[PDB]
Each structure stands twice: as C-alpha cells, then as structure tokens.
C-alpha cells in the first residue's frame, strides 16, 4: 500500500509453523528511507496457541533493513628482478627469471619464480598482487563493520523499538511514545503513525 | 679500546651488570671508543629489579679502560677492567643516581658534569 514491489529472496519455514528467517527485497522509490526506522527488535505478548498450558509468552524478532550498492597502477609498484636459487647447471646461475613486485603505499609484496620465463613470472606475480590487494579490501571492510557493529551492540536493551500486546489489546513505539489500541489495524498493515512519527521526530 | 662485541661492567647502580657494546658512535668506519666516548649498548645480565631490563638497547659512556688514557706529560692511567655508565637514549643523561669505582678528568666537560659529582674518586 505504498506501491513498492516486494520479492522474496530467501525463506526458511519452521518445522511446525511460521518462519525461522526471511529476506525481502523492496523495489521502489525512496524505499530504504521509509523502512530504515524499522530496523531493531520487536516484542510480542500473547497467550500462545501452541503451549499446551496456555501461558502468556513474550517472544522477540528482529527486523533489519540495509540498502544496496554496486587496476593497480604501474607507478605504485616497484619490480625487483633477480636470480633464482636451486638446481640446474649454468642456466640457473646466470639468468634472472625471478620477480618481486611490491606495493609502495601498503607494503604488501609478491613473488614468482616457478617459471623459466621472466615474463610468465611477472604476469603470474601480478595476479597474486591483484588478489592480495583485494584481500585488504576485505580486512578493511570487515574491520569497519565490526568497528561500527561493536558499538551498535553497545545499545543493548534499547535495541527493542516496539511492543505489540495482543491480550492487553494495545501497543507502543518505545522511542517516540506513539500508541494505539487498534491491534489488528497495524498487523494487517496500517503502521504509518509509527513510521512517519519516527522520521519526523528523528528516529 | 672498546669495540663492537666488547663486554663491559657497569659503574652506575642502574640495574645492569654486564653489557655488550654494539656500535661505536660518531663516524663512519669508527673502530674504538676510549674514555669519555658514547657507545650504543645492550644489557645482558641485569639484577632482578631495577630501572632497566635484559635486552634493552641504550647508550652508555665509557669511563674506565684497560688500555688506559694518556695525559699530556706522557703519564698513563690504566685500570683493571673496562666500564661504563648507562645513559638515556635521547637526553643522554645518566640513569643511575650513584657511581661505583674511580673515573677520570677526561669526562670533565659540560656534558658529563653530573657524573664527576657522583664519583667517589676522580684521578
């Protein structure tokens, strides 16, 4: 009812009922920035229909919203070239097969010296130098998730954002204080007193 | 004539006990420290607690040698063992606050005036 198109990427059904996880792409215009308030934990309270007792349970579930987004210069490399070690007569002793590329910005180096041809060894050691600079995009990328994600896990019990309470028959956005008493409005879909009044009041 | 790999005793109280020379400072190709000369050193033996630990690299100044110093009249002072005072790496002041054994007038300068106070004997 905001006209976005709404794929399922991935599911997992639970063995009895509902789902363990799901992933939902959202095609459309200013999507992310509507939904980005809804990242957080959500707290249900009801008498469970699965409990053979019939006890008030108090489950939790995440939502998490994240948007999508879509060669190394010869100046930056020094290329030492030198003789090999090891077995094979006059030819090993003399020629300089072996290469050692080095990146001057970082410090990462490479070799090759498997080959007889210097030019194979160079374009081989260029490959490993591509790979080993792609690998320090993962160790910056992964260590500037778990920088930002270590001090988001700081926030703890606050991480829960909404409280749906289907037997006392009401609700609360815990950040704003915005409240309804119409439970089956919001579950069928009619959220927007929460989603706007977050944005407006700034998460 | 301290040179690289020479082991010296430590005249001060700083913690160290034996040390090894590892450069003679102040020149290319420079062979020897005599008395009053700065050398870079490493600590080998060191007493269980004290200002400095085994493996620390720092400067020292040579204050006694077996080869001996010479005085303008031809006179020689020899000592019986090689020895040095440990110094900070940057300020080049002493670390030790006491000094054991005699020392020499060859120190007598602006720079090592703190030592020739603390010495028991200057020869």
């Amino acid at each position: 009812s905001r006209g976005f198109k709404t794929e399922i990427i991935e599911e997992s059904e639970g063995e009895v009922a509902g789902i363990k996880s799901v992933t939902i792409k959202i095609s459309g215009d200013y999507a992310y920035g509507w939904l980005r308030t809804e990242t957080g934990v959500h707290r249900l309270v009801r008498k469970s229909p699965f409990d053979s007792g019939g006890r008030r349970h108090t489950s939790f579930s995440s939502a998490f919203v994240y948007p999508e987004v879509d060669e190394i210069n010869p100046a930056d490399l020094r290329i030492d070239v030198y003789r090999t070690s090891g077995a094979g007569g006059q030819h090993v002793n003399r020629t300089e097969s072996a290469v050692r590329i080095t990146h001057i910005p970082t410090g990462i180096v490479t070799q090759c010296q498997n080959d007889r041809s210097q030019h194979k060894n160079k374009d081989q050691a260029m490959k490993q130098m591509k790979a080993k600079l792609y690998e320090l995009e993962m160790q910056k990328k992964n260590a500037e998730k778990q920088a930002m994600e270590d001090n988001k896990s700081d926030i703890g019990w606050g991480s829960q954002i909404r409280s749906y309470v289907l037997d006392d028959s009401r609700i609360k956005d815990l950040r704003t204080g915005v409240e309804t008493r119409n439970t089956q409005a919001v579950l069928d879909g009619s959220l927007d007193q929460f989603i706007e009044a977050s944005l407006k009041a700034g998460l | 004539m301290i040179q690289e790999q020479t082991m010296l005793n430590v005249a001060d109280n700083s913690g160290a006990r034996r040390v090894m020379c590892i450069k003679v400072l102040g020149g290319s190709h420079r062979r020897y420290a005599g008395v009053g000369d700065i050398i870079k050193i490493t600590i080998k033996e060191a007493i269980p607690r004290g200002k400095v630990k085994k493996g620390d690299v720092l400067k020292a100044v040579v204050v006694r040698t077996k080869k001996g110093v010479r005085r303008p009249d031809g006179s020689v002072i020899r000592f019986d063992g090689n020895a040095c005072v440990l110094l900070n790496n940057n300020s080049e002041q002493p670390i030790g606050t006491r000094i054991f054994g005699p020392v020499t007038r060859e120190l007598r300068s602006e720079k090592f005036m703190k030592i020739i106070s603390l010495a028991p004997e200057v020869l």
Partner: protein, 45 residues
C-alpha cells in the same frame, strides 16, 4: 551501563546477535490456575 553480552565479538549484524542472547529469550509465565499452577506456600500464608 553497557550490557555485557554472551556473544563473543560481533562481526556482522548486532541486532540479530543480541536476539540470540539470554538478554532476549522467551519469557513464559506461571499460570495461577491449571497446568503448572500448584503453590506450596502462597505469597503470604
């Protein structure tokens, strides 16, 4: 004052990691009648 969580170092997504901490965890309630509801003592007497 910072919750000390039982997850180790979080690596990617922290909300989904705390969801699986004892911090969250189903809270069920004692029935006061029927089917798990027996008290010996009762709150006062």
């Amino acid at each position: 004052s910072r919750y000390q969580h039982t997850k180790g170092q979080i690596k990617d997504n922290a909300i989904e990691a705390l969801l699986h901490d004892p911090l969250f965890r189903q809270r069920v309630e004692k029935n006061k009648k029927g089917k798990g509801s027996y008290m010996r003592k009762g709150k006062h007497g």
